[model samples]
Target: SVKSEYAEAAAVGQEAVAVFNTMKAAFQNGDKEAVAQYLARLASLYTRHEELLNRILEKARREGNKEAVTLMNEFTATFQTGKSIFNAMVAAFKNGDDDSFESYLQALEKVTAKGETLADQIAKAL
Candidate 1:
């Protein structure tokens, strides 16, 4: 059970990280179009994840699984933070603040870490 849970989380995290890294690379290489593409992809990723999380949360709530509900809520909250930061990142790109891009990337990493941690907790609780 733990392995299955860990694998799924790792797979999800790895894909997200790959996309983020691609965005970083695009930014560094001065490929503005690629940067935009990757950023949109990243945002879309969250949109899809949020939908899935909502389903999970709904089921957990119905089943009266408080731990799952709490952890899922915590994980989903990070996406809200992430969306705001991503908007800031776009503004930073428009304003030519490369440092802000770096900061945003780090902030996203932190948010993702929280999700990953919660995923582990969910697996363990199961």
Candidate 2:
């Protein structure tokens, strides 16, 4: 079981890293949908990662400036959106629809666009 756990951890970490790379690409390109898709994957890999989420939020709220706290809250809200859209992508992936493979990119872009709107508001607020 120890090996199993280690294997799982390694796999998850690898997946997270892959998603992280994708997110970097998306962020650099300003491709909101690409970014959203990768974010969803990252979050999904960390399923039941609420503890980490709470820890991050609390730390930001405590040690961060007012602007940072506000932005973190907004990021969390957008993350929730990533969760929803990710579920949809997973379902589509499971269904094995050819179109879904193509559509995944668009769906990700759209959701990320929503997140970008929130980020813009955060920027303006700051």
Candidate topping lDDT? 1
What's the lDDT for all of these models?
A: 0.74, 0.58
Clashing pairs in 1: none
Instruction: State the local distance difference test value for candidate 2.
Output: 0.58
> Positional deviation of 59 in candidate 2, in angstroms?
1.8
User: What TM-score does each of the candidates earn?
Assistant: 0.79, 0.48
- The digit string of per-residue lDDT tens for model 2 on 68-97 reads 467758777766776676666556645655
Clashes of 2: 2
- lDDT score at residue 54, model 2, on the 0-100 scale: 45
Q: Compared with the true structure, what per-residue lDDT tens digits does model 1 show for residues 1-126? A: 333543554566567679988888888899999998887887777566566556666767787888877877776677678778878987888788989988987897787676666777866653
- Model 2 clash pairs are 33-108, 33-109
Clash number for model 1? 0
* Each candidate: RMSD: 3.1, 10.9
